[PDB]
Design an enzyme around this catalytic site. Structure first.
Site, mmCIF file in Angstrom:
data_model
loop_
_atom_site.group_PDB
_atom_site.id
_atom_site.type_symbol
_atom_site.label_atom_id
_atom_site.label_comp_id
_atom_site.label_asym_id
_atom_site.label_seq_id
_atom_site.Cartn_x
_atom_site.Cartn_y
_atom_site.Cartn_z
ATOM 1 N N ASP A 31 1.682 -1.594 -4.582
ATOM 2 C CA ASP A 31 0.246 -1.222 -4.681
ATOM 3 C C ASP A 31 -0.406 -2.020 -5.803
ATOM 4 O O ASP A 31 0.238 -2.891 -6.383
ATOM 5 C CB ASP A 31 0.058 0.273 -4.882
ATOM 6 C CG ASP A 31 -1.185 0.759 -4.170
ATOM 7 O OD1 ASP A 31 -2.247 0.328 -4.563
ATOM 8 O OD2 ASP A 31 -1.058 1.491 -3.188
ATOM 9 N N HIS A 54 -8.204 0.696 18.771
ATOM 10 C CA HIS A 54 -7.917 2.064 18.259
ATOM 11 C C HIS A 54 -9.220 2.858 18.212
ATOM 12 O O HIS A 54 -10.328 2.243 18.360
ATOM 13 C CB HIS A 54 -7.191 2.107 16.897
ATOM 14 C CG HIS A 54 -6.629 3.471 16.553
ATOM 15 N ND1 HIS A 54 -5.671 4.098 17.318
ATOM 16 C CD2 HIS A 54 -6.893 4.331 15.530
ATOM 17 C CE1 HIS A 54 -5.379 5.277 16.775
ATOM 18 N NE2 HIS A 54 -6.118 5.454 15.691
ATOM 19 N N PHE A 79 -0.794 7.448 1.502
ATOM 20 C CA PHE A 79 -0.273 8.451 2.469
ATOM 21 C C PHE A 79 0.629 7.747 3.482
ATOM 22 O O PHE A 79 1.742 8.152 3.764
ATOM 23 C CB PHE A 79 -1.436 9.215 3.127
ATOM 24 C CG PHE A 79 -2.100 10.189 2.185
ATOM 25 C CD1 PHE A 79 -1.511 11.412 1.900
ATOM 26 C CD2 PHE A 79 -3.278 9.854 1.516
ATOM 27 C CE1 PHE A 79 -2.097 12.277 0.985
ATOM 28 C CE2 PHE A 79 -3.845 10.714 0.584
ATOM 29 C CZ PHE A 79 -3.250 11.923 0.318
ATOM 30 N N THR A 80 0.156 6.636 3.993
ATOM 31 C CA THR A 80 0.701 6.049 5.230
ATOM 32 C C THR A 80 1.936 5.229 4.824
ATOM 33 O O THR A 80 2.939 5.264 5.539
ATOM 34 C CB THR A 80 -0.502 5.381 5.900
ATOM 35 O OG1 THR A 80 -0.720 5.901 7.198
ATOM 36 C CG2 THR A 80 -0.390 3.884 5.934
ATOM 37 N N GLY A 102 0.839 -1.212 0.000
ATOM 38 C CA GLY A 102 0.000 0.000 0.000
ATOM 39 C C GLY A 102 0.863 1.247 0.000
ATOM 40 O O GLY A 102 1.637 1.444 0.962
HETATM 41 N N1 LIG Z 1 -3.453 1.560 13.094
HETATM 42 C C1 LIG Z 1 -3.483 2.887 13.053
HETATM 43 O O1 LIG Z 1 -3.137 3.581 13.990
HETATM 44 C C2 LIG Z 1 -3.927 3.589 11.791
HETATM 45 C C3 LIG Z 1 -3.528 4.898 11.569
HETATM 46 C C4 LIG Z 1 -3.465 5.341 10.291
HETATM 47 C C5 LIG Z 1 -4.268 4.752 9.351
HETATM 48 N N2 LIG Z 1 -4.755 3.517 9.544
HETATM 49 C C6 LIG Z 1 -5.312 2.725 8.406
HETATM 50 O O2 LIG Z 1 -4.294 2.525 7.441
HETATM 51 C C7 LIG Z 1 -4.888 2.231 6.162
HETATM 52 C C8 LIG Z 1 -4.197 3.034 5.079
HETATM 53 O O3 LIG Z 1 -4.267 4.473 5.348
HETATM 54 P P1 LIG Z 1 -3.828 5.440 4.155
HETATM 55 O O4 LIG Z 1 -4.065 6.860 4.532
HETATM 56 O O5 LIG Z 1 -2.447 5.032 3.729
HETATM 57 O O6 LIG Z 1 -4.877 5.045 2.999
HETATM 58 P P2 LIG Z 1 -4.631 5.305 1.433
HETATM 59 O O7 LIG Z 1 -5.862 5.028 0.636
HETATM 60 O O8 LIG Z 1 -3.951 6.641 1.280
HETATM 61 O O9 LIG Z 1 -3.545 4.166 1.069
HETATM 62 C C9 LIG Z 1 -4.019 2.808 0.977
HETATM 63 C C10 LIG Z 1 -3.456 2.161 -0.260
HETATM 64 O O10 LIG Z 1 -3.812 0.754 -0.208
HETATM 65 C C11 LIG Z 1 -3.796 0.315 -1.537
HETATM 66 N N3 LIG Z 1 -4.376 -1.014 -1.672
HETATM 67 C C12 LIG Z 1 -5.711 -1.326 -1.709
HETATM 68 N N4 LIG Z 1 -5.947 -2.593 -1.920
HETATM 69 C C13 LIG Z 1 -4.689 -3.149 -2.097
HETATM 70 C C14 LIG Z 1 -4.266 -4.461 -2.398
HETATM 71 N N5 LIG Z 1 -5.096 -5.471 -2.624
HETATM 72 N N6 LIG Z 1 -2.942 -4.667 -2.554
HETATM 73 C C15 LIG Z 1 -2.118 -3.627 -2.381
HETATM 74 N N7 LIG Z 1 -2.397 -2.364 -2.070
HETATM 75 C C16 LIG Z 1 -3.713 -2.183 -1.948
HETATM 76 C C17 LIG Z 1 -4.563 1.414 -2.271
HETATM 77 O O11 LIG Z 1 -4.303 1.237 -3.644
HETATM 78 C C18 LIG Z 1 -3.986 2.681 -1.619
HETATM 79 O O12 LIG Z 1 -2.965 3.316 -2.393
HETATM 80 C C19 LIG Z 1 -6.392 2.461 6.384
HETATM 81 O O13 LIG Z 1 -7.038 1.211 6.637
HETATM 82 C C20 LIG Z 1 -6.396 3.402 7.597
HETATM 83 O O14 LIG Z 1 -7.621 3.447 8.311
HETATM 84 C C21 LIG Z 1 -4.701 2.963 10.805
#
Ligand SMILES: NC(=O)c1ccc[n+]([C@@H]2O[C@H](COP(=O)([O-])OP(=O)(O)OC[C@H]3O[C@@H](n4cnc5c(N)ncnc54)[C@H](O)[C@@H]3O)[C@@H](O)[C@H]2O)c1
Ligand SMILES: NC(=O)c1ccc[n+]([C@@H]2O[C@H](COP(=O)([O-])OP(=O)(O)OC[C@H]3O[C@@H](n4cnc5c(N)ncnc54)[C@H](O)[C@@H]3O)[C@@H](O)[C@H]2O)c1
Ligand SMILES: NC(=O)c1ccc[n+]([C@@H]2O[C@H](COP(=O)([O-])OP(=O)(O)OC[C@H]3O[C@@H](n4cnc5c(N)ncnc54)[C@H](O)[C@@H]3O)[C@@H](O)[C@H]2O)c1
Ligand SMILES: NC(=O)c1ccc[n+]([C@@H]2O[C@H](COP(=O)([O-])OP(=O)(O)OC[C@H]3O[C@@H](n4cnc5c(N)ncnc54)[C@H](O)[C@@H]3O)[C@@H](O)[C@H]2O)c1
Lengths: 312, 313, 312, 313
Positions: free
Chosen positions: B37, B181, B16-17, B13
């Site tokens: 991705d 969380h 952003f994260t 993925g």
């Molecule tokens: N645990 C925590 O404290 C915490 C904090 C931050 C965010 N999160 C979670 O982290 C996740 C990602 O956040 P984000 O801002 O990066 O979201 P985002 O949409 O910016 O990035 C997610 C990426 O996942 C990719 N993805 C989707 N399906 C996929 C697959 N089958 N194979 C590979 N990549 C795939 C998408 O293409 C996308 O680019 C979310 O579920 C969010 O809620 C949790």
């Protein structure tokens, strides 16, 4: 009498401004104020707060605030300007100039009101004409108004050479006069892999390809991203320059500097070799150029004069 | 004979994260980074990775970063960080979010374990208690090898709010949040200090309660400001600390999402608990002596985690 | 230079001084002037030059000089005093206090002549009486004259606890009040592994042996080396205090601070919890101590006054 | 299944250079450190080690540091750094120094290669060229696994003097010094730049000649200032850059002492040459296109080295 932190204001909270802000905070170069327009105030505060919340994990002591109020920039030691529209393929070089110039004027006016002694580094493209615009708007001496261009181009060049030879980028160098793209005047003869001229390591055609890829290196990241411009390497390029000034390092760096006779040019900003320290631009270094290099730079300078003539 | 090899970290993925994490990982020279991705986002991923790599001569790190949609490029990763997932769109139910992300975790895990059978996995994807659980069950790996992130992020927001309240260094502030969380997390002020001084001595209760509630809402606070997506800077930093703890076998004591087999009275769930994190992943779940009030707050947290786990198919 | 580098003078170019100087330079906290007596001028210049010739390898922008001339310390932001004599064979405890008292007064007069606005961090033993001597001779505000002992003692405590539990030193905290040695008061109650009380993780008997090994920590290193005292952890302790001031971090750290009512004591220097930042000691923190913790700090304070009565 | 584990570096000789090297490696978390010395100096070695460890909470690094006279504690070292040497004494002949250090190199290597048969070895001990040669012949390792340090230190002194001359960052000066660690070393001004500008364009010839000379006397200058002992900060810094290059497979181009088998027209000696240094130690000798003037300055250097190799028992 107290030991106070450096204060850095970053104007424009888009990908490059934010990436910069986060790098400055992490390196404890001082406190950071991330600024954008009133309509973008909430996301600017969100980005700044998110960066600040990493501080206990990464273990940096730095304030980060987001704002639309330029009163929060007061007594900035450095301001980095990243506001305005990015370079993209097939764009009207004039339209670029018209909209960004207006932004440089409105920003510069608010910056100098609240930090009349600040040093300013400009990213906004086109960087020669926009740095020129901040210079003249600001009323500052030329040592305080600096543009970024050559560090980024030398970073892409070194990256391509390092990959080509499969060696540390730490031991590869490049060297550029002039701006981006067609305006770029690289000196391969002043580019090396661990001290050895690249011209003895890489056939002329392969070297000319790396140079041409360096010219379109920005467009390369635009083509991959699809709906934005480069931000990691531009932000890193601004941070090296901010660090050279805050820690008075006296780096030799390519920078966009005001010329008063250097290389035989006056009244313009041009990418030249620079010493960067606590007084900003402490020297423009004048190389002995070959007839050819002199010619390629007279060409870059006519492009510079052409873009300055689009300024209202 | 074996030549000295770089550590290898795959980040699944590249939004952003995952991109924020990858850049941090690269800058700290923790090893080479593979940013992964879907095929449809292959080129944006290639752009982010190349932009990061072109920063390397300026910032002065030796690290490879590549973007890919070919999981074979993840082969023999020491650590995989899973950020792959989908955000809850307006009109999508709770149940469809859990199910969609569940199905992403199963498909991602299958490919990850195929190409790196020996890797450790850290999971961010929400809902992170349930999704870390899915990754565990799908991986076939022992529990020590599958870790979720949430506590380090929530303690970081708490330490930020306390540092601001008292005007002291974040370095000298300590928090502890267990549980789930978001709404479900359990910040424990009794185990929270400034310079080792209990916070209940330094901050009146009403203000400290608002700092606890602000911590609970910390995610939404940032969502409400950004007007697209959730936090990434602090999330990414929290993942980098957990990656460091493992790659450098530091034996940190920090909150991680750990599989429970009796600890705190619970079994067959991932929950945020105090952890020793080192070269073998979760080396220990630390069992604190909680009060009735902490136990009751923790049990509400467990109810919610079991609620989300009932939505898994 | 509008962006001046911080300037640190380290008085005393033996083991602690030299090790403090090399860490400061590496961390780019400022320029370093390493000072010793005219007799040791050349070894001082050679230590300084040697460290400086590491700057290209390790990648730090910092000047390091050695000198026997205090004019070279002019306009220092911070002065670290390690100047001290190694207690000779057949020299009383009295003459040791008395000999280092005379060195602190001579050093302080040179320091204020050249840097009247500096912050002073004192290491020289006996460190409470010697910090007291620097304060009175200087005429400085109390926030600008500071002593080191607590950080080093908390560092030893943390190392032992981290070995006992097999965990990161990063997640262990200690708290040591008073002086060094039998005078030092480790507060196991304010001591944690990952926020977890150590009385919950370590049986009383083991916690007691660690408190005693913290008390004896200096002696332990002395007995292993055979000639000299500890320098690595001492130096590291002074660097954290230097960094809290130059970067205005506002750490909560045990430091030797002048008391004017805190803990019911006045007119002495004592190891106490402190907020350390850009104004030096921003405040002394007053804990709610048990009847018992109070008795140990009183025992310690009595020991400090014992040494102060030895001051001519 | 193998858990992640720290790299392991044994430092032989816990004197000025060893101890200083040891404290950098730990602060940078490049691995666990084992400081080795003779049994007579075991307690001072343990004292240094403990002092260093007791700084770790203050400077915030996770590393084990131990002192020992028992080579069993060096078992399974990834890198072994050899600084062990006789303490130079007023009135000791050159014969007795070289001859004594050769014996020390043979005894130390026997123990090193027994407990760490797969390690990379970096040698500092003087005379460094002949001593690296002795560790190579005694180890029975391939030439890529036995590396000497001299040129990094000597280019560092050159870069320092050029930086001071020009009043610019040392980060933007490059130099290249080949040959041995003596008056015979060959600093190559032609392959030396400030921001990639040739130094001949920026420094007059008399000044540049004096810098080259100050580079040759660099070690002596520090000996003459210290009164008793030689340089250790820049030496330790030089060892650390070479250890980092190997542990993180960096593929740096720096001068190191390598076994020549035809390169520059020399066979069967260790000489300071341009190296690619990486995960397999010396990956390649780079052959520069020297001028006849340079070939001859290198030829002399080689003569000086062969003279030392004559004194070898
Ligand atoms: N645990 C925590 O404290 C915490 C904090 C931050 C965010 N999160 C979670 O982290 C996740 C990602 O956040 P984000 O801002 O990066 O979201 P985002 O949409 O910016 O990035 C997610 C990426 O996942 C990719 N993805 C989707 N399906 C996929 C697959 N089958 N194979 C590979 N990549 C795939 C998408 O293409 C996308 O680019 C979310 O579920 C969010 O809620 C949790
Ligand atoms: N010098 C170089 O080599 C180089 C490289 C990268 C891009 N650039 C330039 O740097 C920027 C890179 O793109 P980006 O990520 O910053 O773009 P972005 O659009 O993501 O962010 C730029 C921000 O400028 C803001 N802005 C517009 N008008 C403003 C005003 N009057 N006052 C304050 N803020 C205002 C926008 O609202 C936006 O948030 C562009 O300006 C581009 O021209 C140059
Ligand atoms: N506070 C602590 O935690 C702590 C810990 C370790 C060391 N110490 C103390 O630090 C002091 C120095 O320790 P060291 O190991 O570096 O000793 P050292 O003998 O190696 O160095 C002390 C230096 O002071 C110099 N000096 C003496 N008189 C001077 C003067 N008038 N001006 C300038 N320099 C002068 C000496 O020449 C010597 O080089 C001692 O008092 C020691 O007891 C205290
Ligand atoms: N190659 C270079 O660039 C360079 C530069 C610096 C110094 N040197 C050399 O480095 C060496 C170390 O210098 P230093 O300043 O650290 O010297 P030092 O005398 O302070 O330390 C050397 C240590 O080696 C130990 N030792 C001796 N024989 C041993 C054995 N058989 N096994 C284990 N340990 C043993 C000694 O006890 C001593 O502690 C010397 O030979 C010096 O000439 C070379």
């Amino acid at each position: 009498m107290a030991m106070k932190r450096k204060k850095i204001s970053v104007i424009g909270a888009g990908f490059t401004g934010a990436t910069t802000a986060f790098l400055l905070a992490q390196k404890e170069l001082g406190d950071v104020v991330l600024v954008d327009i009133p309509q973008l105030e909430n996301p600017t505060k969100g980005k700044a707060l998110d960066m600040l919340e990493a501080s206990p994990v990464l273990g940096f002591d730095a304030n980060i605030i987001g704002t639309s109020d330029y009163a929060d920039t007061a007594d900035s030691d450095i301001v980095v300007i990243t506001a305005g529209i990015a370079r993209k393929p097939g764009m009207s070089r004039d339209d670029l100039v018209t909209t960004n110039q207006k932004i440089m004027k409105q920003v510069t006016k608010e910056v100098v009101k609240y930090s009349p002694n600040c040093y300013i580094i400009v990213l906004t493209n086109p960087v020669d004409a926009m740095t020129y615009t901040v210079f003249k708007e600001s009323g500052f001496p030329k040592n305080r108004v600096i543009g970024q261009s050559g560090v980024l181009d030398t970073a892409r060049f070194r990256t391509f050479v390092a990959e080509e030879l499969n060696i540390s980028v730490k031991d590869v160098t490049g060297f550029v006069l002039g701006g981006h793209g067609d305006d770029m005047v690289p000196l391969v003869r002043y580019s090396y892999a661990g001290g050895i001229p690249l011209e003895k390591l890489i056939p002329k055609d392969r070297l000319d390809a790396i140079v041409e890829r360096t010219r379109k290196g920005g467009y390369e990241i635009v083509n991959l991203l699809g709906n934005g411009s480069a931000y990691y390497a531009p932000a890193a390029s601004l941070v090296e320059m901010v660090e050279a000034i805050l820690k008075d390092q006296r780096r030799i760096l390519p920078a966009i500097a005001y010329l008063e006779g250097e290389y035989g040019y006056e009244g313009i900003y041009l990418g030249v070799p620079t010493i960067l320290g606590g007084n900003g631009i402490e020297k423009v270094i004048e190389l002995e150029l070959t007839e050819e290099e002199k010619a390629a730079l007279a060409k870059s300078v006519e492009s510079v004069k052409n873009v300055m003539r689009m300024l209202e």
